Structures are given as structure tokens and as C-alpha cells.
Enzyme design. Structure first.
Site, PDB file in Angstrom:
ATOM      1  CB  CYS A  78      -1.026   0.036   1.130  1.00 22.84           C
ATOM      2  SG  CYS A  78      -0.401  -0.289   2.795  1.00 22.84           S
ATOM      3  CG  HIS A 133      -4.527   0.831   4.119  1.00 21.90           C
ATOM      4  ND1 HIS A 133      -3.774   0.112   3.212  1.00 21.90           N
ATOM      5  CD2 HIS A 133      -5.621   1.256   3.442  1.00 21.90           C
ATOM      6  CE1 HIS A 133      -4.377   0.115   2.038  1.00 21.90           C
ATOM      7  NE2 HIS A 133      -5.499   0.804   2.149  1.00 21.90           N
ATOM      8  CD  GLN A 148      -7.895   0.282  -0.770  1.00 23.13           C
ATOM      9  OE1 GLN A 148      -7.333   0.469   0.311  1.00 23.13           O
ATOM     10  NE2 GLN A 148      -9.085  -0.303  -0.867  1.00 23.13           N
TER      11      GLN A 148
END
Length: 244
Positions: A78, A133, A148
Site C-alpha cells: 500500500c 494503511h 489503493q
């Protein structure tokens, strides 16, 4: 306007190219201090050959490094995805290092969007300490989109950036819902509220059952940074990578 149609085409054509060697390497290199479009696919390949030589060959490299063939096409984590796609969208002729840019810590998402300019495009890079994240929020000239990738392991299931883009990359997400996620308050929301928001905003199928809020780091820190971008310039940069 036809920004959304073009944006979809631009993201599509870009994603399709990523199964190609040179395009994949230039896309997902982790050097952030030079212009992304300045990355040379043979320079990077030589660098890998060198690195492997230094480790006494590919067999030995794999043995010492976890098993990874560093020549293979990458499925970006990510951070790597968020950073690189941020670079591609914002860069013209001056390198932007998304790891070195200043992030906001004590302002809510609603606060900030209200202060942004209306006829300008912005992309927001989000470091979510609660989810562990990184992801992007695209704000073309209000409506928002998520870019993403995710290897999984946390509250959210794994998702390849290609898949995410193809299924949800043009899926407008509610600014309202987005503020509720990006809030210190989010940590103490009921399990089903949290689950619902995560699925809705960040899960490819909008599915509560694929989310696991028991993996949230509840004492997490939320930080984000926005940056203006030239839409035509984003297309330029994307076309370059796709064209290799």
C-alpha cells in the site's frame, strides 16, 4: 465536463500496461527523490543485476532475501502504490518525495476540503495508523475516489491495485462517509459502524464480512497530505509509463 471518463480511460490504460516488464519497473520503483517519468527501465534493470551479482547470484539472492525474484513483476504494497501513484499524479518537472512532504495531524478531513480551491484538482495521501494503511483520495474538480492497494494482514482484505481500479476506481465515495473514517473519533465507534465504513469506502465488494475490526490499532494516528495536480499533466505522465 468529461474529466471522469478521461480519468477512467487514463487509469485503465495505465493499469493494463503494468503486466509489461518496463512499465511495471518504472511504476513501482521506490526511489522517490527523482521525477518518476525520469526512471529508466534499463537503469533499474542494471541495478537489479548488480544487486544480484553482489549477493553471489540469483539463487543465493533468493535464499538470503526471502525467496523473491527481484526481476519479477511487482504486486505493490500500500505504501509503494500510494506513493508512486501520488508521484505520477502531481509531478511535472520537479521531483516530489511523498515520504518527505509535510502531513497534517490536527485537522479533520472536512476542515481541509473546505479550504481547498474549487476549480483545482487535488490528491490526498493518507497514512492511517488505525488501519496501518496508506491509500490515496482523488479529488478532481464535490466528489472523491479511492486509489489503493493492499497485501492484507490488517482489518482489510488484500486487494491488487489493478482490481481495485477496475472495479471501484471510478466509484464516487461520500465526502460525508469519508470524514467519519478520517476522524480521531472513528476509533471509539461501534463495531458495526466501523466495519460498515471500512467495507463501504475501502472494500472491493462493499462487504462487512471481509473486514476485521479486531485487527484495528485503536490507538492509531491519522495523518494526511493533499497536493494540487494538473489533470492534463497526470495524463501525460500516465501515457509515458503505459507507452513503454
Amino acid at each position: 465536463k468529461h474529466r471522469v471518463t478521461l480519468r477512467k480511460a487514463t487509469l485503465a490504460s495505465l493499469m493494463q500496461s503494468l503486466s509489461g516488464e518496463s512499465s511495471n519497473r518504472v511504476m513501482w520503483n521506490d526511489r522517490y527523490d527523482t521525477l518518476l517519468i525520469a526512471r529508466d527501465p534499463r537503469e533499474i534493470k542494471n541495478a537489479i543485476e548488480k544487486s544480484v551479482t553482489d549477493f553471489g547470484g540469483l539463487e543465493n539472492y533468493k535464499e538470503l532475501t526471502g525467496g523473491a525474484d527481484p526481476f519479477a513483476l511487482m504486486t505493490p504494497v500500500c505504501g509503494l502504490s500510494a506513493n508512486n501513484i501520488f508521484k505520477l499524479m502531481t509531478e511535472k518537472d520537479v521531483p516530489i518525495d511523498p515520504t518527505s512532504i509535510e502531513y497534517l495531524e490536527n485537522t479533520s478531513f472536512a476542515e481541509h476540503v473546505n479550504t481547498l480551491d474549487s476549480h483545482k484538482n487535488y490528491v490526498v495521501i493518507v497514512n492511517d495508523g488505525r488501519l496501518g494503511h496508506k491509500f490515496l483520495i482523488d479529488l478532481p474538480a464535490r466528489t472523491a475516489y479511492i486509489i489503493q492497494s493492499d497485501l492484507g494482514g490488517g482489518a482489510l482484505p488484500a486487494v491488487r491495485v489493478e482490481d481495485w481500479i477496475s472495479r471501484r476506481g471510478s466509484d464516487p465515495v461520500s465526502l460525508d462517509e469519508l470524514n467519519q473514517l478520517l476522524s480521531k473519533d472513528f476509533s471509539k465507534m461501534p463495531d458495526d459502524v466501523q466495519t460498515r465504513l471500512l467495507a463501504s469506502i475501502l472494500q472491493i465488494d462493499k462487504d462487512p464480512h471481509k473486514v476485521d475490526i479486531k485487527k484495528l490499532h485503536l490507538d492509531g494516528k491519522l495523518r494526511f497530505a493533499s497536493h494540487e495536480y494538473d489533470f492534463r499533466q497526470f495524463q501525460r505522465n500516465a501515457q509515458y509509463v503505459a507507452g513503454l
